[PDB]
Amino acid sequence: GEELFTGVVPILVELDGDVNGHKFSVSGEGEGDATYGKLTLKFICTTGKLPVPWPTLVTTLGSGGQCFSRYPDHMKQHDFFKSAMPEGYVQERTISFKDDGNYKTRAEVKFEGDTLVNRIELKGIDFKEDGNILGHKLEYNYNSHNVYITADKQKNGIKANFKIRHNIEDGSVQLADHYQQNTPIGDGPVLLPDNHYLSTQSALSKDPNEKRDHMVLLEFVTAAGI
């Protein structure tokens, strides 16, 4: 439940991807603090260079940030993510880049000891050869986003819909529409929320001592709407 997130929880993230035939793997480690709604993670591409830009992977790789959200006192009954723990939940997403391809995922966020683990299977198709993604025209940055959550009582889980604004180097913005569905792994009672949002902010940086392809993610997630 929410009892497992009172202190600093260590995180381990693993991702196997396949974008337009290009195969890659990403490892990540870090820690989250639900009291501050903070998440700090370091990702490394274990297969060499990443064939997609790092900003396009933030919501998938940093999906654990949704579990570390600071929910206000009058809202702690709308926290699905924490209530699904230790057994966790299965997450499936469809990220649609406007005028380009899409990413289809299958993720699992659960507890393995004192460590929260996020394992993802990603498949990307229909990307343009010299488009914003495969052409690496995205700036190494990120903007704020609100994750609009609604309950799916039929499947005992939740649904989420949101838009990500990716800044391009020429001045344009690349829209990435997100569709999300979560369902618990366990049979025990989970918290089914009313309509609300997760106010999320993401800051990206580099580690000047890491020679490998990496990304440092600092995320701040707070709940609101009710």
Short mmCIF file of C-alpha atoms in Angstrom, two decimals:
data_model
loop_
_atom_site.label_atom_id
_atom_site.label_comp_id
_atom_site.label_asym_id
_atom_site.label_seq_id
_atom_site.Cartn_x
_atom_site.Cartn_y
_atom_site.Cartn_z
CA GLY A 1 0.00 0.00 0.00
CA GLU A 2 0.97 3.63 0.74
CA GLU A 3 3.03 2.34 3.71
CA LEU A 4 5.86 1.21 1.40
CA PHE A 5 6.47 4.77 0.12
CA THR A 6 7.02 6.66 3.41
CA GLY A 7 10.80 6.73 3.03
CA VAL A 8 13.39 6.67 0.23
CA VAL A 9 12.69 3.69 -2.08
CA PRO A 10 15.41 2.34 -4.46
CA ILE A 11 14.42 1.83 -8.12
CA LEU A 12 15.68 -0.52 -10.87
CA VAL A 13 14.44 -0.05 -14.49
CA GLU A 14 14.98 -2.46 -17.43
CA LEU A 15 13.81 -1.93 -21.03
CA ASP A 16 14.06 -4.07 -24.17
CA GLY A 17 13.09 -2.11 -27.25
CA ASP A 18 12.61 -2.48 -30.99
CA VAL A 19 12.11 0.70 -33.05
CA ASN A 20 11.80 0.20 -36.83
CA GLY A 21 13.84 -3.00 -36.54
CA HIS A 22 16.64 -1.37 -34.49
CA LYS A 23 17.01 -3.30 -31.24
CA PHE A 24 18.22 -1.74 -27.99
CA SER A 25 18.31 -2.23 -24.23
CA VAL A 26 18.22 0.32 -21.43
CA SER A 27 19.17 -0.15 -17.77
CA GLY A 28 18.33 2.37 -15.10
CA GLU A 29 18.79 2.83 -11.37
CA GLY A 30 17.83 5.40 -8.77
CA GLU A 31 15.58 6.46 -5.92
CA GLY A 32 12.19 8.04 -5.28
CA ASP A 33 10.76 10.07 -2.38
CA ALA A 34 6.91 10.22 -2.25
CA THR A 35 6.90 12.81 0.56
CA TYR A 36 8.52 15.36 -1.81
CA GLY A 37 6.99 13.77 -4.93
CA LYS A 38 10.57 13.35 -6.17
CA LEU A 39 12.16 10.78 -8.47
CA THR A 40 15.84 10.66 -9.50
CA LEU A 41 16.96 8.10 -12.10
CA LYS A 42 20.01 7.42 -14.29
CA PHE A 43 19.49 5.51 -17.57
CA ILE A 44 22.17 3.85 -19.71
CA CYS A 45 21.88 2.24 -23.18
CA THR A 46 23.52 -1.20 -22.70
CA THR A 47 23.64 -2.08 -26.43
CA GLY A 48 25.65 0.95 -27.50
CA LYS A 49 23.98 4.02 -28.97
CA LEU A 50 20.25 4.70 -28.66
CA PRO A 51 18.53 4.80 -32.12
CA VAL A 52 15.79 7.14 -30.77
CA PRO A 53 16.25 10.43 -28.83
CA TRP A 54 16.30 10.20 -25.00
CA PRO A 55 13.31 12.64 -24.56
CA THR A 56 11.01 10.21 -26.45
CA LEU A 57 11.65 7.59 -23.74
CA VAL A 58 11.10 9.68 -20.55
CA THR A 59 7.43 8.71 -19.94
CA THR A 60 8.18 5.01 -20.49
CA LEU A 61 11.49 4.86 -18.61
CA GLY A 62 10.33 7.21 -15.88
CA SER A 63 6.87 5.64 -15.51
CA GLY A 64 7.84 4.78 -11.93
CA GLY A 65 7.44 8.51 -11.18
CA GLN A 66 3.68 7.97 -11.20
CA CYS A 67 4.18 5.77 -8.10
CA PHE A 68 6.10 8.49 -6.30
CA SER A 69 3.47 11.19 -6.69
CA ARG A 70 2.75 13.51 -3.78
CA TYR A 71 -0.97 13.07 -3.21
CA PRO A 72 -2.47 15.76 -0.88
CA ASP A 73 -4.29 14.70 2.32
CA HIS A 74 -7.83 15.01 0.86
CA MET A 75 -6.69 12.91 -2.13
CA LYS A 76 -4.84 9.89 -0.67
CA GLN A 77 -7.84 7.71 -1.62
CA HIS A 78 -7.24 8.20 -5.31
CA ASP A 79 -3.75 6.70 -5.31
CA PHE A 80 -4.03 3.55 -7.47
CA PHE A 81 -0.29 3.18 -8.05
CA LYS A 82 0.65 2.88 -4.38
CA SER A 83 -2.35 0.71 -3.47
CA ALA A 84 -1.43 -1.86 -6.15
CA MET A 85 1.88 -2.48 -4.33
CA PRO A 86 3.77 -4.86 -3.47
CA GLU A 87 2.27 -7.06 -6.23
CA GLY A 88 2.01 -4.08 -8.56
CA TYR A 89 0.37 -3.43 -11.89
CA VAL A 90 0.71 -4.14 -15.61
CA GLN A 91 0.95 -1.01 -17.79
CA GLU A 92 0.23 -0.80 -21.51
CA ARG A 93 0.75 2.35 -23.56
CA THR A 94 0.44 3.68 -27.09
CA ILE A 95 2.47 6.81 -27.73
CA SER A 96 1.56 8.53 -31.02
CA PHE A 97 3.95 11.07 -32.53
CA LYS A 98 2.02 13.40 -34.86
CA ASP A 99 3.10 13.08 -38.52
CA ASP A 100 5.35 10.17 -37.50
CA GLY A 101 5.31 6.71 -35.95
CA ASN A 102 4.16 5.19 -32.69
CA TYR A 103 5.52 3.29 -29.67
CA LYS A 104 3.46 0.43 -28.21
CA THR A 105 4.50 -0.79 -24.77
CA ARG A 106 3.87 -3.53 -22.21
CA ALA A 107 5.27 -2.68 -18.78
CA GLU A 108 5.18 -4.04 -15.24
CA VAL A 109 5.74 -1.97 -12.08
CA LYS A 110 6.08 -4.02 -8.87
CA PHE A 111 8.17 -4.59 -5.73
CA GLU A 112 11.07 -7.05 -5.53
CA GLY A 113 12.32 -6.71 -1.97
CA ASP A 114 12.82 -3.08 -0.91
CA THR A 115 13.23 -2.20 -4.59
CA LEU A 116 10.49 -0.95 -6.93
CA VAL A 117 11.05 -2.48 -10.37
CA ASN A 118 9.82 -1.30 -13.77
CA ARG A 119 10.33 -3.71 -16.71
CA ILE A 120 9.25 -2.65 -20.24
CA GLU A 121 8.83 -4.21 -23.71
CA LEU A 122 8.70 -1.50 -26.37
CA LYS A 123 7.95 -1.80 -30.09
CA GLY A 124 8.09 1.21 -32.40
CA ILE A 125 6.80 1.11 -35.98
CA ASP A 126 6.09 3.42 -38.96
CA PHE A 127 8.75 6.08 -38.30
CA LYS A 128 9.95 8.30 -41.15
CA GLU A 129 13.63 7.88 -42.20
CA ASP A 130 14.49 11.59 -41.80
CA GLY A 131 11.66 12.49 -39.39
CA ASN A 132 12.02 14.24 -35.99
CA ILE A 133 12.70 10.91 -34.23
CA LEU A 134 15.05 8.87 -36.47
CA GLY A 135 16.64 12.09 -37.68
CA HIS A 136 17.34 13.17 -34.07
CA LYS A 137 15.92 16.67 -34.45
CA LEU A 138 14.67 16.81 -30.83
CA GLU A 139 16.36 19.14 -28.32
CA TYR A 140 17.73 17.48 -25.20
CA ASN A 141 14.96 18.82 -22.93
CA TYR A 142 11.39 18.41 -21.64
CA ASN A 143 8.26 20.36 -20.71
CA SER A 144 5.61 19.94 -17.99
CA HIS A 145 2.59 17.67 -18.49
CA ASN A 146 -0.65 16.73 -16.74
CA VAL A 147 -1.55 12.99 -16.68
CA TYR A 148 -5.39 12.88 -16.81
CA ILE A 149 -6.52 9.77 -14.86
CA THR A 150 -9.96 8.10 -14.85
CA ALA A 151 -11.01 4.73 -13.37
CA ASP A 152 -11.82 1.65 -15.44
CA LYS A 153 -14.16 -0.18 -13.03
CA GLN A 154 -14.78 -2.93 -15.62
CA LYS A 155 -11.16 -4.21 -15.53
CA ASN A 156 -10.46 -3.11 -11.89
CA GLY A 157 -7.81 -0.67 -13.09
CA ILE A 158 -7.34 2.83 -14.50
CA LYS A 159 -7.04 4.76 -17.78
CA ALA A 160 -4.86 7.81 -18.49
CA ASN A 161 -4.69 10.27 -21.39
CA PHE A 162 -2.03 12.97 -21.89
CA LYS A 163 -0.01 15.06 -24.34
CA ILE A 164 3.77 15.55 -24.32
CA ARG A 165 5.36 18.61 -25.92
CA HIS A 166 8.79 17.83 -27.43
CA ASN A 167 10.79 20.93 -28.46
CA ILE A 168 12.42 20.62 -31.93
CA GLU A 169 15.67 22.43 -32.87
CA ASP A 170 14.10 24.68 -35.55
CA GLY A 171 11.50 26.13 -33.18
CA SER A 172 8.62 23.70 -33.72
CA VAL A 173 7.02 21.35 -31.21
CA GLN A 174 6.46 17.60 -31.80
CA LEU A 175 3.24 16.35 -30.18
CA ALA A 176 3.26 12.90 -28.54
CA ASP A 177 -0.25 11.70 -27.62
CA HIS A 178 -0.28 9.12 -24.80
CA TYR A 179 -2.93 6.49 -24.07
CA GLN A 180 -2.45 4.48 -20.88
CA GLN A 181 -4.19 1.56 -19.16
CA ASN A 182 -3.21 -0.13 -15.89
CA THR A 183 -4.58 -3.29 -14.25
CA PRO A 184 -3.34 -4.82 -10.95
CA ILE A 185 -1.40 -8.09 -10.73
CA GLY A 186 -2.88 -9.09 -7.36
CA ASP A 187 -6.44 -10.01 -6.38
CA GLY A 188 -6.43 -7.81 -3.26
CA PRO A 189 -8.43 -4.50 -3.18
CA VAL A 190 -6.93 -1.51 -5.01
CA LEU A 191 -8.01 2.15 -4.86
CA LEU A 192 -10.27 3.12 -7.77
CA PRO A 193 -9.98 6.93 -8.28
CA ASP A 194 -12.32 9.72 -9.34
CA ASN A 195 -11.23 11.97 -12.24
CA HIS A 196 -7.95 13.74 -11.42
CA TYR A 197 -4.51 14.64 -12.77
CA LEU A 198 -0.82 14.22 -11.96
CA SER A 199 1.05 17.50 -12.40
CA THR A 200 4.39 16.27 -13.71
CA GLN A 201 7.63 18.18 -14.39
CA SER A 202 10.78 16.60 -15.86
CA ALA A 203 14.34 17.86 -15.95
CA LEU A 204 17.00 16.12 -18.06
CA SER A 205 20.79 16.24 -17.65
CA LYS A 206 24.05 14.45 -18.36
CA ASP A 207 26.68 12.83 -16.11
CA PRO A 208 30.07 14.23 -17.38
CA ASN A 209 31.79 11.14 -15.92
CA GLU A 210 29.74 8.59 -17.90
CA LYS A 211 31.20 7.94 -21.35
CA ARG A 212 28.21 5.73 -22.38
CA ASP A 213 24.85 6.86 -23.87
CA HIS A 214 22.86 8.00 -20.87
CA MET A 215 20.15 10.24 -19.39
CA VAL A 216 19.69 11.57 -15.87
CA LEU A 217 16.04 12.13 -14.98
CA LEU A 218 14.81 14.36 -12.17
CA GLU A 219 11.05 14.28 -11.92
CA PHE A 220 8.53 16.09 -9.71
CA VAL A 221 5.01 14.65 -9.55
CA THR A 222 2.11 16.13 -7.55
CA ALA A 223 -1.57 15.18 -7.69
CA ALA A 224 -4.44 17.68 -8.04
CA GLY A 225 -7.90 18.18 -9.60
CA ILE A 226 -10.24 17.12 -6.77
#
